[PDB]
Amino acid sequence: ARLGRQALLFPLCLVLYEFSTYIGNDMIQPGMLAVVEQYQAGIDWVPTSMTAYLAGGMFLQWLLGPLSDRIGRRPVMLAGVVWFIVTCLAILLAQNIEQFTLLRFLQGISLCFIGAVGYAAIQESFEEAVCIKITALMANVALIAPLLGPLVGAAWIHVLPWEGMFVLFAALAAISFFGLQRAMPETATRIGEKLSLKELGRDYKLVLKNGRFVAGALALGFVSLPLLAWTAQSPIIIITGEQLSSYEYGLLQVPIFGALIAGNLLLARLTSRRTVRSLIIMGGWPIMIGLLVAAAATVISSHAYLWMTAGLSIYAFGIGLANAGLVRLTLFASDMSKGTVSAAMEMLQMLIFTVGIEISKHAWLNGGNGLFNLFNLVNGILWLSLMVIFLK
Ligand SMILES: CCCCCCCCCCCC[N+](C)(C)[O-]
Ligand SMILES: CCCCCCCCCCCC[N+](C)(C)[O-]
Ligand SMILES: [Pr+3]
Ligand SMILES: [Pr+3]
């Protein structure tokens, strides 16, 4: 007795899995101060938790897409959910911060299953119209998690051990596993076919030769890096840096990620009467001004964290308005397999995130908020520079 009611259970559980992998990063960052204290490791390992998680997030997309096409979307997706559960529980037995960070990398591999197999099964399963609605819900979850995560995460370590968070991630994932086991269809259309790694290597070499595709893909990385660098480092900037509490830390997340949502909501309204190109130029203004204000203010006054938050909120508003559009143009900048293009642009932007967060970390360690913000400004200029070519 399962076909109508169990039709929308499949996207629902994939959304739940997407949610748990995202708070798997976003809840952990505030709780990371407790982790650092419990291992007696330096504060420099706080953003490295995210770096490793995102490094794992770019490790397998290239393989998982065409592999799940040959052996099945079901077994590969269920293997990803299981892997997440297992590595979530496995981090409880970590004996030092290096082992913690290593399992943080292994946990992040679970991200690769969302786009390359999960969402591919969505495209293959539903009509164009219904697929749009699921994609919309997936985008909403991506907006809520970086806001709810630091808030719940900061409140969590006030009462419960950080170990408990990973039990929560695995429990949520276990719910999604049983749901995906029952409701996910098999939609792989190349089952039985052999997979050629040499032939797959030729495909990725081909998209990287597309100059216009790479410019847009790097631009998505550079432009979102400030936001990710804030996510990675706000616990150490606010609590250990500014000598503030969890309350301030969490409160400052609201205007920033709230502006992100506001910029996406305005994007939804203006989408019928604006081209993707003009929305990028539209968002370009608050992106540049926001980053400029954050930089200038913390250079003249190192502890002007409210001005920093204000600048990042203005910038975040610009990202909400301009990001989805640039994703769209980058996807269509290469006339090649969507799975390959998606994986390539996911891989490229997460290379910039991982490298950039680590540079960002050293920037703040050596020069405080001024240098943290100046590096963010450079990333904006790099996005802006790529846009003058990508658009003109
Ligand atoms: C508009 C933001 C672009 C970031 C790309 C999304 C990467 C998902 C990785 C999960 C980490 C969550 N986070 C920090 C991005 O909110
Ligand atoms: C936030 C949900 C993600 C799954 C569906 C939307 C992604 C389709 C395009 C893939 C490339 C986009 N990006 C930002 C990951 O590079
Ligand atoms: Pr070929
Ligand atoms: Pr091919």
Author numbering: 9 to 400
Article excerpt on this structure:
A principal mechanism underpinning the unabated multidrug resistance is mediated by integral membrane proteins known as multidrug transporters. The majority of the known multidrug transporters utilize the inwardly directed H+ electrochemical gradient to expel drugs through cellular membranes. In sharp contrast to MdfA, which cannot extrude short dicationic compounds such as the neurotoxicant methyl viologen (MV), I239T/G354E can export both monocationic and short dicationic drugs, besides other well-known MdfA substrates. To answer these questions, we report the crystal structures of I239T/G354E in complexes with LDAO, MV and DXC, determined at resolutions up to 2.2 Å.
The best diffracting crystals of I239T/G354E were obtained in the presence of LDAO at pH 8. The resulting structure was determined to 2.2 Å resolution by combining molecular replacement and single wavelength anomalous dispersion (SAD) phasing. Overall, the LDAO-bound structure of I239T/G354E is similar to that of Q131R, which could be superimposed onto each other to yield a rms deviation of 1.0 Å for 390 common Cα atoms. This similarity suggested that our structure captures the transporter in an inward- or cytoplasm-facing state, and that the respective mutation gave rise to no global structural change even though I239T/G354E or Q131R reportedly altered the transport function. Perhaps unexpectedly, the density-modified SAD maps revealed two continuous, unbranched non-protein electron density features within I239T/G354E, indicating two bound LDAO molecules, denoted LDAO1 and LDAO2. LDAO1, similar to that seen in the LDAO-bound Q131R structure, is seated halfway into the lipid bilayer, at roughly equal distance between the extracellular and intracellular surfaces of the membrane. LDAO2, by contrast, is situated between LDAO1 and the cytoplasm-membrane interface, ~6 Å from the latter and appreciably more solvent-accessible than LDAO1. The closest approach of LDAO1 and LDAO2 exceeds 5 Å, implying that they interact with the transporter independently. Apparently, the addition of the side chain carboxylate of G354E, rather than substantial protein structural change, enables I239T/G354E to interact with a second LDAO molecule.
